[PDB]
């Protein structure tokens, strides 16, 4: 059972995202279900260590946003081309 803490994004787009990644966080998004897609950011190193284990991709995780829990599955992950980093992540509401 993996736990991920996240804040919603006050901004969006290219600039926002590159600043985000240079601050050592990275964008992600949660969609699926009845609700509206929720844009979030994550702490890079936490997620980077968590996704090293197979379970991460096969299992239901919990994302804590504003104290509220959402159960998700990892759908699609974009990785930086030559570096050991993550560009971005899709979580579908489980």
């Amino acid at each position: 059972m993996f736990t991920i803490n996240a804040e919603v994004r006050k901004e969006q787009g290219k600039g926002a995202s590159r600043r985000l990644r240079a601050a050592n966080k990275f964008p992600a998004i949660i969609y699926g279900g009845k609700e509206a897609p929720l844009a979030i950011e994550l702490d890079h190193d936490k997620v980077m260590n968590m996704q090293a284990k197979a379970e991460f991709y096969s299992e239901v995780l919990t994302i804590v946003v504003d104290g509220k829990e959402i159960k998700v599955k990892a759908q699609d992950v974009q990785r930086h081309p030559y570096k050991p980093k993550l560009q971005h992540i899709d979580f579908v509401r489980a």
């Binding site: 197979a54 991709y57 096969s58 990892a74 699609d76 992950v77 990785r79 081309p81 030559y82």
Partner: protein, 136 residues
């Protein structure tokens, strides 16, 4: 020595090599040798690298080459002025962008593959790194 069996055209424009790679991932084997730098692999270089890592694994496991030298490169010979038409085709290259996976390998332990890819990397003009297959 790799080279297109036939082509629609004999000579080519120099072009530019920009952007990132497609196929930054290991689609076949367990391990792969990915290019972090930027540049050209001549056919010869791909051959030599392949040979090195074939020697190192003693013809066990399986090896793929995910790059191919499809672009022709021309040279004017010695003692020739400029102009009077484009030079003749000397050799072929592959254009390599950061992130491209050059070789892939499996049916061997991790260590041996690291060693092998090191040996092969020695024969290539661009900076490289070792990578592994990931779920998703």
């Amino acid at each position: 020595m790799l080279q297109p069996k036939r082509t629609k055209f004999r000579k080519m424009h120099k072009g530019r090599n920009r952007g990132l790679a497609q196929g930054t991932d290991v689609s076949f084997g367990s391990f792969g040798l990915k290019a972090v730098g930027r540049g050209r692999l001549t056919a010869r270089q791909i051959e030599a690298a392949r040979r090195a890592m074939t020697r190192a694994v003693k013809r066990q496991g399986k090896i793929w080459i995910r790059v191919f030298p499809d672009k022709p490169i021309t040279e004017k010979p010695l003692a020739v002025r400029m102009g009077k038409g484009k030079g003749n085709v000397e050799y072929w290259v592959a254009l390599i962008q950061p992130g491209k996976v050059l070789y892939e390998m499996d049916g061997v332990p991790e260590e041996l593959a690291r060693e092998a890819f090191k040996l092969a990397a020695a024969k290539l003009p661009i900076k490289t790194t070792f990578v592994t297959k990931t779920v998703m």
